[PDB]
Symmetry: none
Subunit: 201 residues, 4 copies
């Protein structure tokens, strides 16, 4: 069992040893193909791929598929980190490097080892897990600083307002903690902000 | 490096092999000793410990110390899962079992392997990491169902309202997903709800 | 009359450095001669960081401070001197795009630690060790965000690191992670890779 | 810019509160050292006894007000005839004041805290400590070296603990010319309370 987890770790490290730079795109497994956010994530991933940036996603349906689809059609590699779950996430067919993980831990370690920026489409608890984990790892200095962009102002604004009204206001986090992420609805604004903060087109 | 992480994993498994049942208490490293939430978490942990439940916390300052302090004064073991960080978290002196982790991954694996319930005091990004990770692991069936209680209605309500208005409303999560957690300000309400949903006093 | 002067020096620095990001501070001895290997190393490093878009902040005097400003001044990014008023007057070196002045060490170090995202520490005396242990303390206690700290000169620094490991860490006077707060190197490539890999926003 | 009270107002207020409390406090010594030294460590007993001796000879004792050596210093000074001062620091991870302070002050930042140590002390005793202790040590050495504060005795306690550092200073700083021979003479190292007290008095600390 531990044997398998380590093996899945070693396979991902081999497969990705030559991949740089890279962005991770997170978001809902449930977003339909005809949704605005699906088209958005696909075109963004296409654009980033064509400027030499690899795209890593969870490799399943929904936003993971939109991201892989765009990047599969772009110049750079499309990477998928499929998670094995009772409620099955079928791997999408738009991956140059197709990896599989039995556990969330090794999956996220690959995300955070091999990415230098993060785009977060709207998602559920698992996307919020990813979001607050990378915020934690950055704030604590366990991974290097990197841009984190939430996409969808109507969706995300209420979370940011709650973070300011409750976490910042009570001193549970510092002012610089709130600055670790930005929110945007604009593809141009997003790609600019990513390169402005260290992503290497 | 990988050697050390595995070693820290094995030490925790040895140290905790005889500990059951158990609750985890999460919350801010920054909560001062004279805060209401600090007193609350301490008395709750005291009460739970006296009814035969072990208490696991992050083993550092703030809420982690309040929880260890109460449980250290209770009949059952007090457990601390200290995390090594640049911004140092000094281990508090109220731990029967004092463990140390170089990485968040092994630390949370111990939390989630050895607990059957969760109490979440107000906290920052790292507490939200823990919260949405256990929600994800439960919702996906990677760990068994278990009660998850957020403490502090004024603090937490705005997050729950955002989850309903945005995640549930858009179908990103199901109605049963929102039911995986409850919010309370009352020690009696909390201990009842914990045993009502499987915690074994 | 007095606090107002320090306030004005602080605001002058905030005004001047408002758009300056990213930035690295380089510390080291005022006494290092212009023909010394460490002077050349700091100059070459500062030039390379500068050409990668990183501003370079030094204490603005002679020695390592001048080597750092000289390399940064020749590079694409700005060269900042934080010049200190000493009873034995220290003359500012000629290689500053932004020349700031401070009556006290306190405001000077506050500016270093507010406007830098990484530190490179050449060999120096008591004033360099004040800076070094101050930034380590500020990081350890959560007053300043964690950032790369590189000590340059394996032979020069190794004795201090071995004493820290044996007599501080092994007595529990520092945390197990406190030794990971800094690295020691004397390869320019190694150092540039380390600064990038750990947060310094390199080109 | 938004209309707000400046951050600086807090540091000004904390410095004024310190000056109010310490106005008539003279002479005084600062005792530095690890927050982490156990109560049963030899360093803790040494610092407590020394602080009591200095206090009974008329010398106020200033420490950082927390646990460890700070608690040992304040404990000895509190029992002694002269005042026991704590310069407590406010940190994201709370540091709890020790119960042995006649004068208890609070600082939001290390800078104002150290300014108070250095304005109100005429001598320094440094028990073994970590990075924050070494910050204090090399900061006061720098301020004395450069003439920002008047000459004063600085004593490191524990020849064996400090020897590795003193040897490194000699082999690397002094031998490479980064400091002068006069610089090394700015601090003494001692194991002995009688020798320490004599040294402090010989270099200007006003004993009874």
């Amino acid at each position: 069992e531990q044997a398998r987890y380590d093996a899945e770790r070693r396979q991902a490290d081999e497969a990705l040893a030559g991949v740089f730079p890279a962005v991770s795109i997170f978001g809902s497994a449930r977003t339909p193909q005809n949704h605005a956010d699906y088209a958005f994530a696909c075109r963004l991933a296409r654009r980033l791929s064509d400027s030499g940036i690899a795209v890593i996603s969870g490799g399943g349906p929904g936003i993971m598929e939109a991201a892989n689809k765009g990047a599969f059609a772009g110049k750079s590699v499309s990477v998928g980190l499929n998670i094995v779950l009772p409620h099955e996430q079928k791997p999408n067919p738009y991956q140059d490097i197709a990896l599989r993980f039995s556990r969330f831990a090794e999956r996220k370690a690959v995300f955070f080892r091999y990415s230098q920026a993060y785009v977060v489409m709207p998602g559920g608890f698992g996307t919020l897990d990813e979001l607050f984990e990378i915020l934690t790892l950055v704030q604590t200095g366990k991974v290097p600083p990197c841009p984190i962009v939430l996409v969808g102002k109507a969706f995300w604004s209420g979370l940011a307002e709650w973070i300011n009204a409750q976490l910042l206001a009570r001193g549970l986090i510092s002012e610089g903690a709130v600055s670790l992420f930005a929110i945007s609805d604009d593809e141009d604004e997003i790609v600019a902000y990513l390169s402005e903060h260290g992503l290497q087109t």
